[PDB]
Design a protein around this ligand. Structure first.
Ligand SMILES: [Cu+2]
Ligand SMILES: [Cu+2]
Length: 128
């Protein structure tokens, strides 16, 4: 079945999807992130970070304290299942992860850890 998704986050604080479904016959799953807009990474950086729904708050809280030079993730954060780089306008990055990290029945969120962004640049991810 399809095992990749293209995602944009723009300068208007939107990802172009808020809901990803990962087909359970996929062995790996790829997210391709790009960033329409004009603003640089240090003011309008976005990443795509996956964790369980329950872990999202703590990843976001620790990430935002970690600084730009950490790409806004706490180093060795074991809650992070997969993520792209933090990217600014005009840049792109992909991540491919093993679908065996995901479990059916569990709720996942993807989100941006750039400070303050996750209230807007987030959505759900389901293994179906
Ligand atoms: Cu397939
Ligand atoms: Cu952002």
């Amino acid at each position: 079945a399809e095992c990749s998704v293209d995602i944009q986050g723009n300068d208007q604080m939107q990802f172009n999807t808020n809901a990803i479904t990962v087909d359970k016959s996929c062995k790996q799953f790829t997210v391709n992130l790009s960033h329409p807009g004009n603003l640089p990474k240090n003011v309008m950086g976005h990443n795509w970070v996956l964790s369980t729904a329950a872990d999202m708050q703590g990843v976001v809280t620790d990430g935002m304290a970690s600084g730009l030079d950490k790409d806004y993730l706490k180093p060795d954060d074991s809650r992070v299942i997969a993520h792209t780089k933090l990217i600014g306008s005009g840049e792109k990055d992909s991540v491919t992860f093993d679908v065996s990290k995901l479990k059916e029945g569990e709720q996942y969120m993807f989100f941006d850890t750039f400070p303050g962004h996750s209230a807007l640049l987030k959505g759900t991810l389901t293994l179906k």
